[PDB]
Amino acid sequence: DILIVWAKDVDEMLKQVEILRRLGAKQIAVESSDWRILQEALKKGGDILIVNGGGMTITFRGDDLEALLKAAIEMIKQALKFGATITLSLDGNDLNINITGVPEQVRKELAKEAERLAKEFGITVTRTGGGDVDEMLKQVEILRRLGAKQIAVESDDWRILQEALK
């Protein structure tokens, strides 16, 4: 079997991999949309790299944790209406919202609603993951040239990302 560490933070990733290595895990894969986490996973001896090229992460930032929640609520209602799977975690002043299981048209709508909500509630929003096909080709080659022998690519929607196979 393979154990896959879904990693959102480089230091969280390193701790999780070491915890599993300590207990004798022989096949550790690290999964991220963050190229930095994948490069650090590779240096620390991750057996498989999984490039997550699908979904979307919306991060609301602000010292008013109430205002982050109120924006996150409107995103959640919108995302659930579109049939999304939504994962939420509060990491300091960052409310992290991962959205999967929706097509590109819905990704674009939820990104614009996230930007609107940020201004309405007077907070900051950053969007990551589901980057362009050229960037994925470029960064996957960088992983290979760094010595990555085992790369998998993951998406909930291959209708655009199929361009990467041509």
Added chain:
Amino acid sequence: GDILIVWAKDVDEMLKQVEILRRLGAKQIAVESSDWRILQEALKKGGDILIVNGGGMTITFRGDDLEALLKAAIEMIKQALKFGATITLSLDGNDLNINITGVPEQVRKELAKEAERLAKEFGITVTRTGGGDVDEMLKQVEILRRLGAKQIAVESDDWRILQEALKKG
């Protein structure tokens, strides 16, 4: 070539995605899902690499009032984030499906109580299900292997789930 993973929560979308990749000449396609039906269907249609990702404390709210499920959803997110938990939600017809990870068993018990409380308040049912238990995962993994899964991976953001899966693997 690289192994290409199709993440799926719908069986029909899963098959369409696998066909897109197969049409372009993808040699090794993996299917990833928390839904054991979708993983089983991936095997029936000739797949053999599967990723199981649904581990943790799984709770289902059920009701005819969509707006009451939505309200209970919001309140559970508030409560989860307060305890520093990671919360995954999906609205599947009249069922709001929730998975809680990143916390110890002591914190799991507290969020289960608040789930039963919010069920009563908003006039909906809660099913505290062992679907996310690693014992349930191992049983379902054995079924996948007997249905022809040659490569199984267990995925989580929670080191506690992967640790428990390693020890019993």
